[PDB]
């Protein structure tokens, strides 16, 4: 039974949704206490899209991982440190470019 | 008188002896066959004659430490801790586990 | 030899039977391979078992280190098991230097050395964020030389030197200062490499 | 030689028909004197007697390392790999 | 089949095996000039001179054959006396170029002073210079660089065709060029530029433009000519400029 | 017309006078950058008081490397600088990394978050050559409101 | 060796104990100390204002890069990628095409001021002497542009330092 990590292939699934309540519940507190920056609604949509990408389940040593690194990116707003808006800003704002068409990413000349 | 450390030594005599009697038998409780009984024995075996021969000298300090009683004291304290936790986790009397992957030259 | 060699082995005879002495409690919990070589010592960890290593060496009557210094890791791709915590030992007593090492991958979590010594979790702190070697049952992992919003490890041999998100411009926005960009200025890649092996005995069999 | 634009210097063209240079407008540009190794040919060649001969900028003290030149194919002017000096006979 | 011992360990061999062939197996090159790969056989430097376990004077290892059961020491003391040695009698008459010279750091003279060659100190008075030998588009020839050896004398012979290089006379003042005023010829013999070790033939068109650093190396198909397959080409910042070919087992023969 | 003109330039000779800077104990270039107030090279009522806070300062020293962790850090305090201001980069990290630039870490040249006005070039800023940061500091400081 | 730090109480009876305590009730030994500053305002200051008055250096010292070149024309710089490789920060950059016949030495030759830690190396690594080191100052730019020199030209134009490298370099030949 090597390697522990920290829970079973089963286990580790409400593991993450243990961490997802104390990150809902953030969301309203991160616009109060530190800035009022974009929306409490677009905000929470933010968070939706960061799990979706995250999402593949094949190792529990993979997905206990990722626990213990959201008890800190997530958990730098929680003891409530010093970010300065621009930390904790996951979107890109100044960068525009999303371009995946062969039509439209050759006219644009890459790769 | 005051030692260089903030453990403040006390004037007690035959106090280093009560935790190196302690000590031995706490080694004859698991491991027996194991070397780990075997080599530290000696090493207080011919310890506790020193002070035993020694009539309150600071040469009975000077003996393998040099830095007082207080200081050698230390070093007994935490040998009852570190004995108990020999025997607690199993790894001197067994040797069963895994090797590693066969690499080493950089 | 008169500025051909730096010094003479002397102690290397006194410091080999430091080799035999751990070896001699022979545990396959501990032990596996011992290394001497330029008047240091070097012994390699199994991961199951480190803390037992850690409170020997520290304490006993014969080899009194107890300080626990200074707390390195290696970055090597080479081999089945990617990195290697390496502990630096010095001992104020016994006056003599010692190096403990771990072989595991350790991409999957190890043991801490908190409760042995004190000034370790914060050098615990340092692998965590270089490499992401993770530690069991340790108190705080807060992060050190890393961004507060940074993605993976900055130390690993498998990304660039330049990393992903490293430029950060002021631009349009009047108070947030952004990220997303990554172009940098071109770091030439020296392809030098010398022909011939420089040194004997150093060279293995396929 | 310049011509339009500001002068070349060791070979460098400034823009065709102002394009990519606009920068260097405001600020005059930079011009180093003699940089078309017009002083190079200046110098006389020396004469020499032996069949090859050590060259030197100025001894130990100034930067030129030991390089023997041979002076025996006539047609060819003979020069070292640092100075532009040329040897006959 | 017979096996022979190179520096204690044993290694199988063929009968009819050359020493520095037979070394190769067991994982140790030995110092060399005269090239085993393609190139014929030959003396002409004495280099890779080797001391065996009973061996009143040193034997080269290009010549000598294994033959017997005999057993040969690569890091002895006898054979590092020979190595730091040789360097300095091809480097008595050595011009001085490093700086100027085309190559710097694939130059295998270069190499092999580093790891082999006496560092300490080197006694000269007087080098003597040779006079520049005639080359038209491809190779700038300058025979002062030249070492004075047998490589590119053979690669005129065999491998390209017709002969040009041979040589010119007897003592120091022995030139390594054509020395009647005549261009060669193209076919194959624009592969002798990276034939020869030291810096003394060169291309043209890669004269002074890049050094053996900075440049870094990708391989790739040659396009121009079929059956010509791998080739090296050094980017060295957004455009290429230098070329070379890669060794191949089957698709060529160490020349582009 | 000639009074309205050279009372501009009574104004900017309260600058030419006058500038405090900022203890921006950021790396190696604020040891030098001590070494202002170090006797043998000063500038000690010359035209340099310290006395640090962002907000009396009217000059900004940026002395030595910048990082990611501290871009966010430095952009505000020259925000919270009266608007008359100048930033002077001293030393080559202030200018893009003295090694670094292609470090994963370090920001590239201070003006990426913050513009800068006076280039010194100095690793090891030697305090002769620093003298120039804030003398021709006084020197550039030429002509403010024409109408 | 053993230097103690602790005195081990200097006070032990009657004349030792009242003077000991004479400097606590009133002061004495912070008027001791207040005149150990009063003999020192005293004493001439050891200040050098700069735009008159200059500082102490050194025959060897190294401030903004300048090529050197040889006494009848030419570039001592002879193109060799040895100075880039040495250089720690990469700030120096060379890329090399034969000059019109003959010789053959550079084309593109930039040092960046963004970067460069000053260490001397290129200084020493050049078998030629092209760059040395002068005892420079006085930079200072507008924008980062005009900070890094360009190819040579600027460099070149360092003619006006050259003659204190020509009297520099003479305790440089057979070091000190
Ligand atoms: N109210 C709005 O937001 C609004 C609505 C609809 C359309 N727009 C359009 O969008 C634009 C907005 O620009 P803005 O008003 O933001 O610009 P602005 O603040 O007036 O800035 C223009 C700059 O140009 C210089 N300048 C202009 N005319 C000059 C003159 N005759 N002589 C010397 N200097 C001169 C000024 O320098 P000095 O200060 O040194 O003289 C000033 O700094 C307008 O052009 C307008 O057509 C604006
Ligand atoms: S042939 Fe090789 S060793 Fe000789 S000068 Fe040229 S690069 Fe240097
Ligand atoms: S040119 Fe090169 S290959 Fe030919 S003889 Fe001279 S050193 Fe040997
Ligand atoms: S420029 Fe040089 S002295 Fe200044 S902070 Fe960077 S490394 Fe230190
Ligand atoms: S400065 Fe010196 S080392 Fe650098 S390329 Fe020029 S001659 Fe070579
Ligand atoms: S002084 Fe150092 S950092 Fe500056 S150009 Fe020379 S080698 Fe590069
Ligand atoms: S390398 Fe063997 S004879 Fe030249
Ligand atoms: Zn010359």
């Not at chain 4, 001894?59 to 006539?74: F, Q, S, T």
């Not at chain 5, 491998?159 to 022995?174: K, S």
């Not at chain 7, 030495?105 to 078998?127: L, N, S, V, W």
Request: some cysteine; aromatic content about 10%; overall charge neutral.
């Amino acid at each position: 039974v090597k390697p522990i990590f920290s829970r079973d292939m089963n286990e580790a699934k409400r593991r993450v949704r243990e961490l997802y309540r104390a990150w809902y519940r953030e969301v309203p507190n991160t616009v109060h206490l530190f800035q009022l920056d974009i929306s409490v609604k677009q905000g929470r949509d933010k968070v939706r899209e960061m799990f979706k990408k995250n999402a593949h389940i094949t190792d529990p040593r993979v997905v206990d991982l990722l626990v213990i690194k959201g008890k800190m990116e997530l958990e730098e707003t929680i003891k409530v440190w010093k970010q300065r808006t621009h930390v904790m800003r996951f979107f890109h704002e100044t960068e525009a470019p999303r371009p995946k068409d062969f039509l439209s990413k050759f006219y644009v000349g890459h790769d | 008188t005051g030692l260089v450390g903030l453990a403040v030594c006390e004037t007690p005599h035959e106090r280093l002896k009560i935790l190196y009697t302690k000590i031995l038998d706490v080694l004859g409780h698991i491991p027996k066959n194991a070397a780990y009984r075997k080599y530290t024995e000696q090493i207080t075996n011919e310890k506790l004659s020193m002070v035993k021969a020694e009539p309150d000298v600071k040469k009975l300090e000077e003996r393998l430490q040099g830095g007082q009683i207080e200081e050698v004291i230390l070093q007994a304290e935490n040998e009852l801790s570190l004995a108990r936790k020999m025997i607690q986790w199993k790894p001197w009397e067994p040797l069963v586990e895994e090797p590693p992957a066969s690499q080493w030259k950089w | 030899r008169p500025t051909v060699r730096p010094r003479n082995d002397v102690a290397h005879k006194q410091l080999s039977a430091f080799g035999e002495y751990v070896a001699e409690i022979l545990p396959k919990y501990v032990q596996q391979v011992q290394v001497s070589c330029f008047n240091e010592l070097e012994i390699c960890i199994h991961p199951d078992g480190v803390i037992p290593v850690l409170t020997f060496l520290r304490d006993h009557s014969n080899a009194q280190f107890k300080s626990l210094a200074d707390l390195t890791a290696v970055d090597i791709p080479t081999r089945q098991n990617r990195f290697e915590i390496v502990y630096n030992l010095l001992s104020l007593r016994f006056n003599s230097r010692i190096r403990v090492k771990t072989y595991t991958d350790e991409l999957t979590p190890i043991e801490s050395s908190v409760p042995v010594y004190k000034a370790a979790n914060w050098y615990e702190r340092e692998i965590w964020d270089m490499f992401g070697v993770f530690f069991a049952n340790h108190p705080d992992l807060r992060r050190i030389l890393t961004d507060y919003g940074f993605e993976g490890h900055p130390f690993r041999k498998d990304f660039p030197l330049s990393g992903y998100v490293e430029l950060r411009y002021d631009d349009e926005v009047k108070r947030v200062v952004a990220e997303p960009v990554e172009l940098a200025q071109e770091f030439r890649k020296f392809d030098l490499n010398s022909p011939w092996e420089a040194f004997p005995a150093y060279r293995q069999p396929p | 030689x310049x011509x339009x634009x500001x002068x070349x210097x060791x070979x460098x063209x400034x823009x065709x028909x102002x394009x990519x240079x606009x920068x260097x407008x405001x600020x005059x540009x930079x011009x180093x004197x003699x940089x078309x190794x017009x002083x190079x040919x200046x110098x006389x060649x020396x004469x020499x007697x032996x069949x090859x001969x050590x060259c030197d900028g100025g001894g130990g003290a100034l930067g030129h390392p030991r390089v023997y030149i041979n002076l025996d194919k006539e047609t060819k002017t003979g020069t070292c790999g640092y100075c532009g000096l040329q040897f006959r006979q | 089949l017979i096996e022979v011992f190179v520096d204690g360990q044993s290694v199988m061999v063929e009968p009819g095996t050359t020493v520095l062939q037979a070394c190769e197996k067991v994982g140790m090159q030995i110092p060399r000039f005269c090239y085993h790969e393609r190139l014929s056989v030959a003396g002409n430097c004495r280099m890779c001179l080797v001391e065996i376990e009973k061996a009143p004077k040193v034997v080269a290892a290009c010549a000598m054959p294994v033959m017997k059961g005999w057993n040969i020491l690569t890091n002895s003391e006898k054979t590092k006396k020979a190595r730091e040695g040789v360097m300095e009698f091809l480097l008595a008459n050595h011009p001085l170029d490093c700086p100027i010279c085309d190559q710097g750091g694939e130059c295998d003279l270069q190499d092999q002073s580093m790891m082999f060659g006496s560092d300490r100190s080197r006694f000269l008075e007087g080098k003597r210079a040779v006079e520049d030998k005639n080359i038209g588009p491809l190779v700038k020839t300058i025979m002062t660089r030249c070492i004075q050896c047998t490589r590119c004398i053979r690669f005129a012979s065999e491998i390209a065709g017709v002969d040009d290089l041979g040589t010119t006379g007897r003592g120091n003042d022995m030139q390594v060029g054509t020395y009647i005023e005549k261009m060669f010829m193209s076919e194959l013999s624009g592969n002798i530029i990276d034939i020869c070790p030291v810096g003394a033939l060169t291309x043209x068109x890669x004269x002074x433009x890049x050094x053996x650093x900075x440049x870094x190396x990708x391989x790739x198909x040659x396009x121009x000519x079929x059956x010509x397959x791998x080739x090296x080409x050094x980017x060295x910042x957004x455009x290429x400029x230098x070329x070379x070919x890669x060794x191949x087992x089957x698709x060529x023969x160490x020349x582009x | 017309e000639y009074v309205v003109a050279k009372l501009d330039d009574l104004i900017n000779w309260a600058r030419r006078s006058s500038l405090w800077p900022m203890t921006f104990g950021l790396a190696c270039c604020a040891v030098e950058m001590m070494h202002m107030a170090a006797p043998r090279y000063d500038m000690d009522r010359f035209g340099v008081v310290f006395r640090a806070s962002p907000r009396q300062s009217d000059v900004m020293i940026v002395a030595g490397t910048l990082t990611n962790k501290m871009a966010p850090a430095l952009r505000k305090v020259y925000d919270q600088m009266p608007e008359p201001r100048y930033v002077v980069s001293m030393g080559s990290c202030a200018n893009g990394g003295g090694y670094y630039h292609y470090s994963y870490s370090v920001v590239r040249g201070c003006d990426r978050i913050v513009p800068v006005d006076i280039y010194v070039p100095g690793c090891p800023p030697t305090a002769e050559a620093l003298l120039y940061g804030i003398l021709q500091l006084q020197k550039k400081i030429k002509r403010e409101k024409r109408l | 060796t053993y230097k103690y730090v602790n005195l081990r109480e200097p006070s032990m009876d009657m004349k030792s104990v009242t003077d000991r305590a004479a400097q606590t009730l009133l002061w004495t030994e912070l008027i001791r100390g207040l005149g150990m500053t009063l003999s020192y305002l005293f004493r001439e200051p050891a200040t050098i204002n700069y735009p008159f008055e200059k500082g102490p250096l050194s025959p060897r010292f190294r401030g903004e890069h300048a090529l050197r070149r040889y006494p009848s024309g030419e570039e001592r710089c002879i193109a060799c990628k040895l100075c880039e490789a040495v250089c720690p920060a990469q700030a120096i950059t060379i890329e090399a095409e034969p000059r019109a016949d003959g010789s053959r030495r550079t084309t593109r030759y930039d040092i960046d001021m963004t970067k460069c830690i000053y260490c001397g190396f290129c200084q020493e690594a050049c078998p030629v002497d092209a760059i040395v080191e002068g005892p420079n100052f006085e930079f200072s730019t507008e924008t980062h542009e005009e900070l890094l020199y360009n190819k040579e030209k600027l460099l070149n134009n360092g003619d006006k330092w050259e003659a204190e490298i020509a009297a520099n370099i003479q305790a440089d030949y057979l070091y000190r």
